[PDB]
Design a protein around this nucleic acid. Structure first.
Lengths: 180, 141, 124, 262, 20, 101
RNA sequence: CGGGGAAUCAGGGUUCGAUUCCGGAGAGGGAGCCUGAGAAACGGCUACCACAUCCAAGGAAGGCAGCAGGCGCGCAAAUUACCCACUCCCGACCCGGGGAGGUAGUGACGAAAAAUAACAAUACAGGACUCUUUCGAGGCCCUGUAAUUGGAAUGAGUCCACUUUAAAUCCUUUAACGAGGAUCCAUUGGAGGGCAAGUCUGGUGCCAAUUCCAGCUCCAAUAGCGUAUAUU
């Protein structure tokens, strides 16, 4: 008897076969293109996509006017549209089976900081977010994997206390300007 | 042919029960005599006291002389013969040292190279042989 | 100056003779505001004296913009002395506790039960 | 065990209390009283979790033993006193009155009532017996015994009783076509008119009830509380009128409410 | 000198593997 | 001829170079049962003490891997140390066990 | 001990459930009672059996499968810490008590998040595009590699103050110091017989092949990675 919860889940699955060249090359491609730390982040996003595809196939086995199929398919499609992975006009459970890992990778905060020109590269974007230079609508975010919603796409701003933002300079600039 | 009758569940169950008893993994895991005769007592590791040091000859197509320790286990008094990774690691082992021993690695099976040894030395005097062989830690006496 | 105080979930509790609310504190470039300052600002906002205001449980959010805590304003000091917990009342300097450990009280209690009579009062 | 229990673990508490997992290992454990353990809302959960005058159980005790809370017109200072269906809670200091009646989801709604509605309550008659010297007694669902009832009042009927005195003032028969509310089972909280009662001797009767929207649902006879005569309830109802919306129309109503405001 | 670690080691391995 | 060896430590470092030399000779000769006691934890400011002990544990773990660091500051801790000394599994040295000394 | 349940999962199944919820059982082994609404109660009593404490030798006391802690056993498991502030419980009771419970300590069981560098100029190496049949020219771009330069950005740490809290710690928030070999230095394993990865080097012995030892190079995952045993 403790007032503690023990509920937790693993957020990835390891691949079944360890050393396959095509899978290794595809994972390395996605790591390099999206500036990721290791293979586990690719496996995490792959796990999320596999769970969503399993939910879509399960709802596709149901008949069209099943209330659970309509309710849960509508909720799943609404979530996928809300994080920008699917288009608003493609709200249909068949198109979920055509989704790719690259859309979920593009909706990360690292990729959006790169694509909105706040960073000169994807690795610059990662080190920018990690060092409290980025805010999303009011809130400083450190997490590169922060998945951005379409309502927060236009509010990625740039940290009103950051030296490149609000203006108060960093440690190096005060130390170097103090010499002379 | 097998029976497919809709009222034949009891016969199917009885036959599957006997024919599971004919399965060697099932018999080991359920009869129990494999765990009573196992020197480890069904555990993963065992501590022992080194009785002697011997030399076991290797297989015929790859002739060599491997060096082993004769060790009596603490919890049941059974004698086993344990493998040392090289002759350099054997200089850390003396008679009457408490030694922690694991299995060789092929799940109860002996070596494809050294005939009739199934155990490897993991620790001596509460320090690992890897730490002694790499100079990371020293052992007392 | 730049620190601002808002009160969100206001309630007038006639049963415990107080007003209770959630306090939002904006300090855009500072550290977390000390509780005596928040008590003074609430004293000006609610047109009362600051010895009947008790604030607690302040968490500053990530990034340092906003801090949320809880506050309550009592009608008098007597109702604050009735209804407030002893620790929050001692945070204002209004209550003092025994400086005795649990081991001391427990071993003294177990030593008094080997003696019967008013000689129990002679047990240290 | 060797005797009766005094503790209720928090995960083993009734789910409609809406307690969380991490506040403690214990739940408030209702006292013995006029209601069952599984079918009551204790006073500490009402004054702290629902109505939010108090933040701790110690503040609940400070509220209750200043003699402010009346349950059915009687001052109670037991913080775990079991209050249940149709019970009137009166706070004279803040001028508030409540009836503990169910939501459409089977949870005790915070239902505010008028101070003239707090003068009375409804009770379901659970047994009729004649005691010594030929004196008829009824026993209600909240452990009330009334001597000399109307000879027309039977078991499963509903008495409208006056909390000032405790005597029978009016009554409603169990009949096909009367309004009822479901107080147990899977249809807890729903309201409708009785359309068919089928009888199973030596077993449980099954009452069929039709909703005001035309939905039909059955319950046992134990789960039926007759509220109003024919079609008009004799007490105030919550915001939902016993109409259980499905999850689709509840999502639609939530989206329309979000669209209208915001 | 020292080898890079983390995201930089993977960036180096990617630049070696797919860029050229 | 010791039955047990009580090694003493300071909170900040583990041991001196003289302590390292002594420990090398003592390990190589043969150790009886031993216990590790630290002397100056309570002399430190409180806000570091727990962390200091953690650091000390790491400095010990490279030579004494699974050994509890007792504290020897008060008479109460002295009695606890004596109780740990009296009831403890004794290490047996074969050479002195086979001969009368 | 049984269930709720857990691992796997196309489906059927297979293995696990001592363990925080529910029900049962027991308090060293048996047995018998008292009191009470409720016990065949053991943080009650009375015997015997097995152990065992004190003694002036007559006598007296015992029950950690409670919280800590110790010995033993072993491959195998934490502090003789603080507090009733929270959750609740008991009592004549708003007030007292609770090793229930809460809070710190140990804790790479396991699960989540997530640093160990980024950019600009310059120099070489490529790839596009304009002008040339081409060689070639591009103050034309793009992308890499740096025993090359350059200040910008930061945490890890050190350490005021708040906040936190029963009191504290931690986290969060903030002053100050805090980065070039940013030495503020990432490991664990495997490869020259098949999945990922070797036409390598030097010692030491046997009759160029061939035992043992130490390296280099490459590959994998990464704050983690090997091993044994069981199981799927």
């Amino acid at each position: 008897p403790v007032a503690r919860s023990w509920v937790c889940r693993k957020t990835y699955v390891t691949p079944r076969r360890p050393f396959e060249k095509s899978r290794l090359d595809q994972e390395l491609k996605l790591i390099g293109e999206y500036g990721l730390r290791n293979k586990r982040e690719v496996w995490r996003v792959k796990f999320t996509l596999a769970k969503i595809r399993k939910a879509a196939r399960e709802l596709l086995t149901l008949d069209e006017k099943d209330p659970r199929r309509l309710f849960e398919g509508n909720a799943l499609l609404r979530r996928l549209v809300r994080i920008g992975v699917l288009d608003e006009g493609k709200m249909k459970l068949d198109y979920i089976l055509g989704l790719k890992i690259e859309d979920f990778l593009e909706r990360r905060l690292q990729t959006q900081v790169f694509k909105l020109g706040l960073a000169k590269s994807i690795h610059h974007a990662r080190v920018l977010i990690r060092q409290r230079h980025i805010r999303v609508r009011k809130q400083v975010v450190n997490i590169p994997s922060f998945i951005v919603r379409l309502d927060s796409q236009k509010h990625i701003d740039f940290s009103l206390r950051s030296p490149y933002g609000g203006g108060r300079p960093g440690r190096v600039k005060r130390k170097n300007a103090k010499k002379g | 042919g097998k029976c497919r009758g809709l009222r034949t569940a009891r016969k199917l169950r009885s036959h599957r029960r006997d024919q599971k008893w004919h399965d060697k993994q099932y018999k080991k895991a359920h009869l129990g005599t494999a765990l009573k005769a196992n020197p480890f007592g069904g555990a993963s590791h065992a501590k022992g006291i080194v009785l002697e040091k011997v030399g076991v000859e290797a297989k015929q197509p790859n002739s060599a002389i491997r060096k082993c320790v004769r060790v009596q286990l603490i919890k049941n008094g059974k004698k086993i013969t344990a493998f040392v990774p090289n002759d350099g690691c054997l200089n850390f082992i003396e008679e009457n040292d408490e030694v922690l021993v694991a299995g060789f690695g092929r799940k109860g099976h002996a070596v494809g190279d050294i005939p009739g040894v199934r155990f490897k030395v993991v620790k001596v005097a509460n320090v690992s042989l890897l730490a002694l062989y790499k100079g990371k830690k020293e052992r007392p006496r | 100056d730049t620190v601002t105080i808002r009160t969100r979930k206001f309630m007038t509790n006639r049963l415990l003779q107080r007003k209770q609310m959630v306090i939002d504190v904006l300090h855009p470039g500072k550290a977390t505001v000390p509780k005596t300052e928040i008590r003074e600002k609430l004293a000006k906002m609610y047109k009362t004296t600051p010895d009947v205001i008790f604030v607690f449980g302040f968490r500053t959010h990530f990034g340092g913009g906003k801090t949320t805590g809880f506050g309550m304003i009592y009608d008098s000091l007597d109702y604050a002395k009735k209804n407030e917990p002893k620790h929050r009342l001692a945070r204002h300097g209004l209550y003092e506790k025994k400086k005795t450990s649990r081991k001391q009280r427990k071993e003294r209690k177990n030593r008094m039960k080997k003696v019967r009579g008013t000689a129990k009062a002679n047990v240290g | 065990a060797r005797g009766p229990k005094k503790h209720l673990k928090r995960v083993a508490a009734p789910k409609h209390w809406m307690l969380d997992k991490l506040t403690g290992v214990f739940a408030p454990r209702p006292s013995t009283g006029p209601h069952k353990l599984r079918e009551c809302l204790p006073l500490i959960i009402f004054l702290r979790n629902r109505l939010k005058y108090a933040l701790t159980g110690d503040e609940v005790k400070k509220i209750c033993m200043q003699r402010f809370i009346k349950i059915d017109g009687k001052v109670r200072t037991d913080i775990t006193y079991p209050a249940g269906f149709m019970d009137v809670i009166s706070i004279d200091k803040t001028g508030e009155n409540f009836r503990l009646i169910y939501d459409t989801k089977g949870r005790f709604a915070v239902h505010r009532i008028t101070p003239e509605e707090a003068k009375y309550k409804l009770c379901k008659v659970r047994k009729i017996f004649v005691g010594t010297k030929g004196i008829p007694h009824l026993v209600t669902h909240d452990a009330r015994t009334i001597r000399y009832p109307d000879p027309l009042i039977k078991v499963n009927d509903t008495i409208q009783i006056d909390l000032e005195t405790g005597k029978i003032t009016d009554f409603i028969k169990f009949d096909t076509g009367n309004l009822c509310m479901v107080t147990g089972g899977a249809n807890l909280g729903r309201i409708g008119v009785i359309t068919n009662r089928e009888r199973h001797p030596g077993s449980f009767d099954v009452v069929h009830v039709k909703d005001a929207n035309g939905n039909s649902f059955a319950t046992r006879l134990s789960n039926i509380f007759v509220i109003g005569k024919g079609n008009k309830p004799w007490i105030s109802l919550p915001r939902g009128k016993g109409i259980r919306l499905t999850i689709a129309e509840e999502r639609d109503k939530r989206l329309a409410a979000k669209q209208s405001s915001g | 000198k020292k080898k890079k670690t983390g995201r930089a080691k993977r960036r180096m391995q990617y630049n070696r593997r797919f860029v050229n | 001829v010791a039955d047990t060896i009580l090694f003493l430590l300071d909170p900040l470092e583990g041991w001196d170079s003289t302590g390292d030399y002594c420990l090398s000779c003592l390990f190589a000769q043969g150790l009886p049962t031993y216990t590790l006691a630290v002397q100056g934890i309570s002399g430190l400011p409180l806000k570091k003490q727990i962390d200091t002990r953690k650091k000390l544990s790491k400095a010990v773990e490279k030579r004494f891997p699974h050994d509890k660091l007792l504290l020897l500051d008060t008479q109460q801790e002295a009695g606890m140390l004596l109780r740990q000394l009296a009831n403890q599994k004794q290490q047996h040295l074969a050479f002195r066990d086979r001969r009368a000394y």
